[PDB]
Design an enzyme around this catalytic site. Sequence first.
Site, mmCIF file in Angstrom:
data_model
loop_
_atom_site.group_PDB
_atom_site.id
_atom_site.type_symbol
_atom_site.label_atom_id
_atom_site.label_comp_id
_atom_site.label_asym_id
_atom_site.label_seq_id
_atom_site.Cartn_x
_atom_site.Cartn_y
_atom_site.Cartn_z
ATOM 1 N N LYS A 181 12.379 -15.243 -7.933
ATOM 2 C CA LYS A 181 12.331 -14.991 -9.376
ATOM 3 C C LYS A 181 11.562 -16.121 -10.067
ATOM 4 C CE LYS A 181 15.046 -14.628 -13.620
ATOM 5 N NZ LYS A 181 16.346 -14.186 -14.192
ATOM 6 N N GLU B 276 -9.241 13.093 23.223
ATOM 7 C CA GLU B 276 -9.116 12.154 22.098
ATOM 8 C C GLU B 276 -8.048 11.109 22.401
ATOM 9 O OE1 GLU B 276 -10.094 12.664 18.188
ATOM 10 O OE2 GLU B 276 -11.895 13.302 19.289
ATOM 11 N N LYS C 296 29.481 -22.865 -0.481
ATOM 12 C CA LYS C 296 28.807 -24.179 -0.449
ATOM 13 C C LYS C 296 27.458 -24.251 -1.163
ATOM 14 C CE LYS C 296 27.438 -24.002 4.492
ATOM 15 N NZ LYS C 296 27.428 -24.879 5.693
ATOM 16 N N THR C 297 26.645 -23.173 -1.188
ATOM 17 C CA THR C 297 25.358 -23.253 -1.884
ATOM 18 C C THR C 297 25.404 -22.534 -3.275
ATOM 19 O OG1 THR C 297 24.299 -21.303 -0.935
ATOM 20 C CG2 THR C 297 24.117 -23.383 0.393
ATOM 21 N N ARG D 115 6.308 38.535 14.451
ATOM 22 C CA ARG D 115 6.591 38.320 15.877
ATOM 23 C C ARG D 115 5.731 39.197 16.812
ATOM 24 N NH1 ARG D 115 9.342 34.839 18.495
ATOM 25 N NH2 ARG D 115 10.057 34.120 16.448
ATOM 26 N N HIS E 115 -4.529 20.241 17.034
ATOM 27 C CA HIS E 115 -4.162 20.729 15.675
ATOM 28 C C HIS E 115 -2.672 21.066 15.605
ATOM 29 C CE1 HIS E 115 -8.336 22.535 16.321
ATOM 30 N NE2 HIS E 115 -8.595 21.558 15.442
ATOM 31 N N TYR F 288 -8.689 7.781 6.864
ATOM 32 C CA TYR F 288 -8.310 8.853 5.959
ATOM 33 C C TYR F 288 -7.079 9.556 6.538
ATOM 34 C CZ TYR F 288 -11.069 11.822 9.188
ATOM 35 O OH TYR F 288 -11.519 12.428 10.334
ATOM 36 N N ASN G 165 6.263 32.119 14.243
ATOM 37 C CA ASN G 165 6.970 32.805 15.338
ATOM 38 C C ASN G 165 6.212 32.553 16.629
ATOM 39 O OD1 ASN G 165 9.202 33.984 13.835
ATOM 40 N ND2 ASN G 165 7.811 35.520 13.077
HETATM 41 O O1 LIG Z 1 20.292 -13.716 -13.759
HETATM 42 C C1 LIG Z 1 21.182 -13.943 -14.503
HETATM 43 N N1 LIG Z 1 22.171 -13.132 -14.487
HETATM 44 C C2 LIG Z 1 23.475 -13.554 -14.537
HETATM 45 C C3 LIG Z 1 24.179 -14.735 -14.143
HETATM 46 C C4 LIG Z 1 23.719 -16.063 -13.445
HETATM 47 O O2 LIG Z 1 22.471 -16.171 -13.090
HETATM 48 O O3 LIG Z 1 24.643 -16.996 -13.248
HETATM 49 N N2 LIG Z 1 25.481 -14.591 -14.466
HETATM 50 C C5 LIG Z 1 25.697 -13.484 -15.001
HETATM 51 N N3 LIG Z 1 24.443 -12.789 -15.087
HETATM 52 C C6 LIG Z 1 24.325 -11.451 -15.683
HETATM 53 O O4 LIG Z 1 24.350 -11.666 -17.191
HETATM 54 C C7 LIG Z 1 24.626 -10.343 -17.809
HETATM 55 C C8 LIG Z 1 25.918 -10.455 -18.569
HETATM 56 O O5 LIG Z 1 25.871 -11.534 -19.490
HETATM 57 P P1 LIG Z 1 26.277 -11.580 -21.028
HETATM 58 O O6 LIG Z 1 27.711 -11.792 -20.976
HETATM 59 O O7 LIG Z 1 25.578 -12.773 -21.529
HETATM 60 O O8 LIG Z 1 25.816 -10.324 -21.627
HETATM 61 C C9 LIG Z 1 25.146 -9.423 -16.653
HETATM 62 O O9 LIG Z 1 24.096 -8.588 -16.507
HETATM 63 C C10 LIG Z 1 25.404 -10.423 -15.431
HETATM 64 O O10 LIG Z 1 25.041 -9.801 -14.383
#
Ligand SMILES: O=CNc1c(C(=O)O)ncn1[C@@H]1O[C@H](COP(=O)(O)O)[C@@H](O)[C@H]1O
Lengths: 520, 518
Positions: free
Chosen positions: B138, B332, B67-68, B442, B279, B220, B422
């Site tokens: 990133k 201590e 989904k995401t 020993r 120690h 330290y 020992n």
């Molecule tokens: O961050 C981006 N990395 C991604 C993505 C994405 O963000 O959808 N898809 C593929 N990769 C990575 O792209 C590299 C391979 O791609 P090429 O085929 O262009 O050489 C490889 O290193 C793949 O791992």
Amino acid sequence: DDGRRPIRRALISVYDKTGLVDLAQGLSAAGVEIISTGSTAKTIADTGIPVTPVEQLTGFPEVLDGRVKTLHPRVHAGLLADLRKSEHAAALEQLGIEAFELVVVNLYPFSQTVESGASVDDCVEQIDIGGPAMVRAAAKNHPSAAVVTDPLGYHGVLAALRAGGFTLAERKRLASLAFQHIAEYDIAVASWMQQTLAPEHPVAAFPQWFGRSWRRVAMLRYGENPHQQAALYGDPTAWPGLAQAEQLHGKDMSYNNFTDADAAWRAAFDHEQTCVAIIKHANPCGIAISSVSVADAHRKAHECDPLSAYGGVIAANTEVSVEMAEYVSTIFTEVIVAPGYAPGALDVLARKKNIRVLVAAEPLAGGSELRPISGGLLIQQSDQLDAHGDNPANWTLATGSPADPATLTDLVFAWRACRAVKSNAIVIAADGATVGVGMGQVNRVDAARLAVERGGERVRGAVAASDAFFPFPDGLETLAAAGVTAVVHPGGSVRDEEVTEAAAKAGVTLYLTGARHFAH
Amino acid sequence: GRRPIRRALISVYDKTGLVDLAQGLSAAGVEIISTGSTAKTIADTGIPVTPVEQLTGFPEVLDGRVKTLHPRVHAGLLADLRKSEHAAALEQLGIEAFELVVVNLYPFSQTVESGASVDDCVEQIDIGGPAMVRAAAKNHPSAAVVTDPLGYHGVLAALRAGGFTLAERKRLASLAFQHIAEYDIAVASWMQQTLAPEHPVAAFPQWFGRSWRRVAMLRYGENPHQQAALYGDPTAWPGLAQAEQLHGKDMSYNNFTDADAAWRAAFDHEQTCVAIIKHANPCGIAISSVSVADAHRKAHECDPLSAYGGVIAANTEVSVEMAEYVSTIFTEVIVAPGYAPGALDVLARKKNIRVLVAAEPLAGGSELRPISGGLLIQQSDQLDAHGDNPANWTLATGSPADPATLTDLVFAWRACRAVKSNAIVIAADGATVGVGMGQVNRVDAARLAVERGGERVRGAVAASDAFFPFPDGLETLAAAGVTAVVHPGGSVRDEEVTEAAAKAGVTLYLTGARHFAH
Ligand SMILES: O=CNc1c(C(=O)O)ncn1[C@@H]1O[C@H](COP(=O)(O)O)[C@@H](O)[C@H]1O
Ligand SMILES: [K+]
Ligand SMILES: [K+]
């Protein structure tokens, strides 16, 4: 059933194209459909092998300079659909999506980009998003999908291809290797971000987060004692050490062999002159320097406590000569470690079948020391004997005549040798060799008495070093009464005057360093 | 480099502070894009939510697995808005950017600790969650990623200030990658151990990974010229690194190693035990069937001079009676599983004494020992070897030990583990009386134990952590009046050592188990 799933469709997206053409040729010959991103598709297509572009499958282009190419459900549904579930297999059919049995991906070279001294922005640009998402998806869905993250496994892919696919067990193994690869990549990215991208202000000696991983080198026969199981691990991102030492001869290295060899190696490199250190279950038998030869340093180190040196571990900070090797061959020795061996030295050592003959890389300056405790970890800078007070020009002559050049060399030798001895430590030395060592005592006067007793007739006229200040005059008096002429210790006690007066009454030369070398 | 927050992507395991965060964001006019139970928790308050399916226009399939994982999500997260091309690429695609990303994962170490099945653990592996966190981290020059509800106050403050600064986005990115690293270490570890173990199964895996969080910078390390820090493993069972400090000055590096050694030595005995360290070395160790105060007095009496400035560990609650005596001795550190009502007040009379409460240790466990370029890992010596049970001991010579002598032998035997090799431990009435420690030879350890034991050696028992290589070590003990000795045996010269004990009329036991320690 082995749970073999015939490979029909493969998703290939690799930064490093090593072995790709041979892999793709093998897959296309078997009738496997190859789905690839931009340049991976180019490398394969230029050979005449047909490629399905990822955009054909998704209907969405590669955008934002290769940032969002495979982050699409028409890629990830084929990777993540659990084909053991009738519902998931039907969902792919409802979407017109087919599954991927093979996923071949290797990541942006982040750790290499960092090591090359590339800028903050180029390092950030080498953070792979899609790559790890595809690897993690296929690894999670290992009951259906096979994920390969290393060109080293490409011939295994072609073998599985000939066998009608990977087994369920082989897919579990690939999934585990894949998540290992991802954790390593994440560790490198998180470590670099803390150190370079967002360091603390003001900058701290140790970061807020610390992460490391290791690869097993070998299972050991046992640990410190037979009832304990143990293993050796190597840090592949570290400068080579004892864990990477090349074994030229002898039986398997034991756990105690590694800790002794590590202790011996560090003690030999604690001296700038040619040095031989002999260690037996963490304790020094003898340590010696020489301006003649490595064989001379070994004879003098051996002569400290010859009985304890039998079954000991030897380290030399220089090449082991044939002459040294000849004498070592007459003494029961478990391990010998050196940066190298002279032509013919190994043959002389190899006369005794069991002795472990190691070649190790010379250690680097600085470095951190990891010391686990229950629930956590202590990290400190390695004691490299580089404190202000470790330089003898910074020593204070509390009493007596200044040390002549031969006495000062012995004092500096005994001072540096005291670090390797567990506290409370007393090192009695003469002519660049330890003669009497008082080790690991709760009470400093017990360490002084031990050094004097073990030193015997060689104590009169020798020098002594104390790794921590004398809390009372008795420890120093023990040394002076035995005939020690010069003593070096940190000083720093409220009772220093009482200790200095005791040395003055004995006519003993006494140096105060202002630096201590506790070691446990 | 402040960027006003207009659109936020929220998907969290830990829903702590979510409603207040969402209320603050909606009030500022921030569009919230959410899914699952996170979306319901926000929507049930009356706060409007853009569901992820409305954004993507892709049907819910494979129980939400993808989904995401959609460009309508990730293009908004990853478009570098410093580039005019990416900002225009977003407009030509019809996808809006995300300035805020609030995602926190179910700790996988907790998924494995909750005792979920292999199938459920596999099902729990989050793909989308980490992909969203990684993408925003990133793209930190444009996006702010929050992975901890502890930073929600900071989000609302940034919201009032017209967004996060570039510097705070860099810090959030670093924290986000640490949380990804920790997650992926726990999946990878669970896969070495449970999903794909070696065949045959090995005691230690092919890959080992761990991470730690800094608890404090220390003044330290072992010596003043060395810088140091303390780290805690949040996925581990609590130990010294998590000890609660109730009183005293800052803990030093040497205080932690001494307290760790003392704690382990006290828990090496099933009876009420007090261990005193200095120690990394033992001053005194004692057990008691009377009280913890009695074990402390007997442990202190071994070497009272060295106990001055020492570190005390009790394997049971410290009483007011023990605390009263401890208050008269320069100490201590004191570490215990707890303190009786009033005990802390008695200890707090001395301003500097560091008073610690630590969790009782667990059985088994791995011991990490770094070496240059790598790591040694072994099973912790838990004194559970076949030969550690006295019923499995061999009476080499002499009359069998009477019940009081055998209790002292077993005490001395177990206490020998904590002493650096020992080691020779001379004991009587459940207390060490003379300890020979850390010797290469020993016989030197035997002489030290006898000298330090003094007048209390005659009639006492002794334990040797490794076999006597020659009769002299045993003769040293016998000549001093030691009545019974226990050692592993296993030397080719065992007969000569046994003959020397016979000549002295000494009871001698051979255990077949050794306890080297360094
Ligand atoms: O961050 C981006 N990395 C991604 C993505 C994405 O963000 O959808 N898809 C593929 N990769 C990575 O792209 C590299 C391979 O791609 P090429 O085929 O262009 O050489 C490889 O290193 C793949 O791992
Ligand atoms: K030392
Ligand atoms: K021991």
